[PDB]
Amino acid sequence: TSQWLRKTVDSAAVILFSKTTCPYCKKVKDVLAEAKIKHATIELDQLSNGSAIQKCLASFSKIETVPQMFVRGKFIGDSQTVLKYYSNDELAGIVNESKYDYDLIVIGGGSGGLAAGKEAAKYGAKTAVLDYVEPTPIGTTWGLGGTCVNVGCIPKKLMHQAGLLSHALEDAEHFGWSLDRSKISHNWSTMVEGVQSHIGSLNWGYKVALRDNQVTYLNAKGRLISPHEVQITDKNQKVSTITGNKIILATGERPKYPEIPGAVEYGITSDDLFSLPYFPGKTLVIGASYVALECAGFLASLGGDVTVMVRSILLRGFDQQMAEKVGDYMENHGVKFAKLCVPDEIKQLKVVDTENNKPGLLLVKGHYTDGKKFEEEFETVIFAVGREPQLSKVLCETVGVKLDKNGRVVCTDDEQTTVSNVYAIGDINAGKPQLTPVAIQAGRYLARRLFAGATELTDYSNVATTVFTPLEYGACGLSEEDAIEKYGDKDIEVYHSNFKPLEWTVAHREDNVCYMKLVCRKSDNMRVLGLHVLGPNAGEITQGYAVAIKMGATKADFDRTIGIHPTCSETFTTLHVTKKSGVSPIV
Amino acid sequence: TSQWLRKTVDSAAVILFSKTTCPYCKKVKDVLAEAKIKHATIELDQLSNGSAIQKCLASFSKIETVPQMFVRGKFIGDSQTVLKYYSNDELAGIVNESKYDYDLIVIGGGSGGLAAGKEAAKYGAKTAVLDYVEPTPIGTTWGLGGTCVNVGCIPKKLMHQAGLLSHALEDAEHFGWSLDRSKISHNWSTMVEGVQSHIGSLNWGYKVALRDNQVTYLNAKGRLISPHEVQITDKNQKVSTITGNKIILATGERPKYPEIPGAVEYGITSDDLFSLPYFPGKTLVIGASYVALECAGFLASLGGDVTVMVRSILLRGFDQQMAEKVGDYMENHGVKFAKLCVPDEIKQLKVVDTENNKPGLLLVKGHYTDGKKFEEEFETVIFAVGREPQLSKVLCETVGVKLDKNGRVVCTDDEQTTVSNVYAIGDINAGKPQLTPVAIQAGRYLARRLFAGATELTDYSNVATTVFTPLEYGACGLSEEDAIEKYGDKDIEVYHSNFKPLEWTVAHREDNVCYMKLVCRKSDNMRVLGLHVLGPNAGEITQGYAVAIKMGATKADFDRTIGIHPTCSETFTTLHVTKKSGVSPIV
């Protein structure tokens, strides 16, 4: 309790201890509101041990009454001392007094960093957010908001949507719409322009949002040179230094290139794909990550000639039964796979036409595991062979922020690095799921612990995911193989079923391709250890179930729940075929 | 325990008490399997009080060992007596010996009745399912499977889908597809033909399914004349009588007509809509149920001129804030509403063209609450002014099955009517949510209690729903107004937010129309009392959350869960604006 309280007092920029039923508190609140002074507030009457807290406060203030106002680790006064400060118009300089230029500097203006920034400023923390987008080899760059906004989830899903509309056009005819499909084509550059216009509205909405929370935004490359000092290089190359109490590292990752001749010069990554000025044309995706398969899938649904070169397996780290079903759907729907194949070199045959927005032309040479040569021409070659942080570009090694062997930041469960005022969130936080909503929740929850005395940690267990392949794949919890490894085969029951979306019946799409399973623990009341679903809208299906699983759902909790009919998701409420039973999951 | 056991013994058609680790049991199992004798099995080693049960069994068998086999309330033997019966080829006549023609007669071959039938036969119950479809006034009729399959959820959602594809065609252009929309039209009869072909495959799949579980299917009108006697009229008018141990009434409801001149002669209901041989054309829907709005919505999205005549409010019994938002979306997207208006008469101006499949033409006369006359021409007039059971057509009043004032069957929480061998499931069970998955779960769970010694009851609390209006509306739990009425305003907190599907950004659809809220109980740890969402795929969104709510989810359980990005459903995991705060839910 006093451990909690001295952390809180030391860390908050401007915090008020208070009670709901306290008119002097309210008059402090109103004076600060009226003064445009943002602050955290702890209502001691709403905590089970507010009494203990009010008492231990005397260790900081020499008093035990509410209101108590602190600034940057130091008691400032009760009601009368605040009004004294206000009426003398000394309050501004009081609440702005700091050893440092800022209470918080965020390095990286992405998902985690913007969320942490905004939330901190809400409680009075003087905040600066730094963001700079180092260009890709071909010079692609973009605005504020990080990987998801600009070159990730947002444009990725929009282009997935454009792909799904392909199949909407096909389905439309069976549902009675008179459509001349022989005279329908897709225009890559019209789609990119719409995608990029929505992104620009996000770049701009984030700038505006920072402005509206009095966050300082610096489009500058940050480098942490000591615990509290960040050296910024601006657009001009002008160098300067700013100081901050807390530092949040939220710099994300960038795509890796394979170390082969031609890769950097002639290939592209997802960084370039989503603003590509020309239709990629006949495309080779090298990789097997969810990024690789997502991109191949939508390019193929847009009518493209698409090949995916796979070294070993699809979606390493995901349930491999589900990965195979993902892959099988894509193969039967236009995506070619060069299985057990690696690339040796990219040779240029045509340069990109900057004039007519046409792709160039490339010769990809590689080899299969069976010794046969791979040699084929593609207009575009995309690498999706993983991503890596670039922290030597951000961290003077002298500061003492410890990195792991992969270059990610080693953190405690409250995101603290080995430099105690420096935290790391998002993709660079070693061992955490690399997902936008995780980074947002981490940054916001961290900001609350730093600046408003919260204690809640981010829960990184059982974080649900969706892969937006042509047929989508959502999961929450363990893969079937990881559950068996953890608990043993004898203790695992798997219930499963195929299903067919009603939307697919009249459209003449496949029976017994969509599929779901619950991976359960026999010895723990058939606890649901992992949920897996392959089918349309798989993220909408999966999300709600993640709440139940977080609460410890069992098979019996699924069974008790009544279905919504007609939906895909309702099939989770009637599963009865187990894998051990050997009975077929088909319907 | 002995109460449970004598119910079980009396009711099961063919049940075996047993243990997993019992070779004589297995040899009984295998002889019966080999004999094609279906039966229930209770493994006493898997119940906490299997010991007490094995003991109390001596009250029925004079023995205390496993295996113990019963038929229709009477001990039949241990291992040796069964093999004795088998080897003498007396076992068939033993397990077929019954006071009654059937162990179970289901009256009504719909959602509940087919599910109860199939599940009962699984455990050896000799089962007959009766179904007959009394024609609509214009002579429409259909095949096996009940209201949902033929004239409800299935064709309703398929035509909703055909409507959604309309908006897919519009969206397609913004996502880059070159589409001449000025030359696209919808063909009603092509859609109906696809819809009806899928229905026929369900009619046929249900027949096949009954055949494969040795259920007898009689396309005959059933009438219960005494507790155990059903009088059947067949296609021919040939009358006969069959007897059954247990009777399940699962006869559903039929559409009501308003008592006004012309309604029966010239209007139609949903019963007729889904196989209508002609495009309805300019249509008037009289009503404000979810059926009324669902039908108006898809007709309008198919290009139709659609008017809905509303007496008072939309969707009485649903959250009225959500109903208004549903209605507002439809008004801004092509549906006209004649508010506070009732019909007085339907006059015919043109007869339906049976030849060219063109609608007729009707004059609808009515009056508004303000005294102004309503008079307008429509090609089709649909009544969706509620539904009612027709039990006098099924129940000789002499049998003693008690009905309520609305003609529905008064039941205990195990679906038992006031005639103890007669149960009621589905829409005719008074006070229960009238939904297909409820009826399926009730029928299956009931069948298990009757014929395999199960005890689990159906849980009718917090049953989630989705209304498939043009913008869909899913709910689970209480409306905001019912929660306030139950607990009082002071004890209710409502968190809410607008949201925008990512799919809508590039498509230029509305900000701040989709919407969700959690209705919570302050004094019970912010327990989620009701969840409400308006937006695409609202049934996929809502379903998973119904499991969490069944488990007692609180706001904190929602907050702890990490979102899947990008999805609509993820917004439930980050809600923070309360209604009391007066802060706007817009984003």
Ligand SMILES: Cc1cc2nc3c(=O)[nH]c(=O)nc-3n(C[C@H](O)[C@H](O)[C@H](O)COP(=O)(O)OP(=O)(O)OC[C@H]3O[C@@H](n4cnc5c(N)ncnc54)[C@H](O)[C@@H]3O)c2cc1C
């Ligand atoms: C193709 C692709 C698709 C994806 N799809 C999804 C999805 O569908 N759902 C999901 O949840 N996640 C998805 N992700 C992951 C998601 O993008 C990341 O989890 C998220 O963007 C990372 O948040 P972050 O804050 O860690 O880093 P980022 O979002 O990458 O932000 C880091 C920012 O800091 C900048 N920066 C780097 N160094 C400096 C420096 N010295 N000074 C100043 N600024 C610097 C970076 O240029 C960047 O702008 C996808 C990723 C990719 C590559």
Ligand SMILES: Cc1cc2nc3c(=O)[nH]c(=O)nc-3n(C[C@H](O)[C@H](O)[C@H](O)COP(=O)(O)OP(=O)(O)OC[C@H]3O[C@@H](n4cnc5c(N)ncnc54)[C@H](O)[C@@H]3O)c2cc1C
């Ligand atoms: C337009 C409409 C849309 C709907 N959409 C949905 C939805 O989207 N999701 C959902 O969950 N629910 C929906 N419903 C409700 C759903 O249809 C019902 O809950 C379900 O069909 C009722 O199941 P049941 O077994 O009670 O009766 P029914 O399905 O109606 O089956 C009763 C059967 O018994 C027959 N019968 C009647 N009398 C006799 C007799 N004497 N002898 C023999 N047979 C007889 C009947 O003709 C019928 O075939 C919808 C209903 C309507 C009208």
Ligand SMILES: C=C1C(=O)C=Cc2ccccc21
């Ligand atoms: C296992 C696979 C599959 O099923 C389909 C495609 C594929 C491609 C590359 C590697 C493996 C697979």
Ligand SMILES: C=C1C(=O)C=Cc2ccccc21
């Ligand atoms: C409250 C309504 C609304 O918002 C829109 C349409 C409507 C139609 C009939 C009755 C009420 C409404």
Ligand SMILES: [K+]
């Ligand atoms: K269920």
Ligand SMILES: [K+]
């Ligand atoms: K959350």
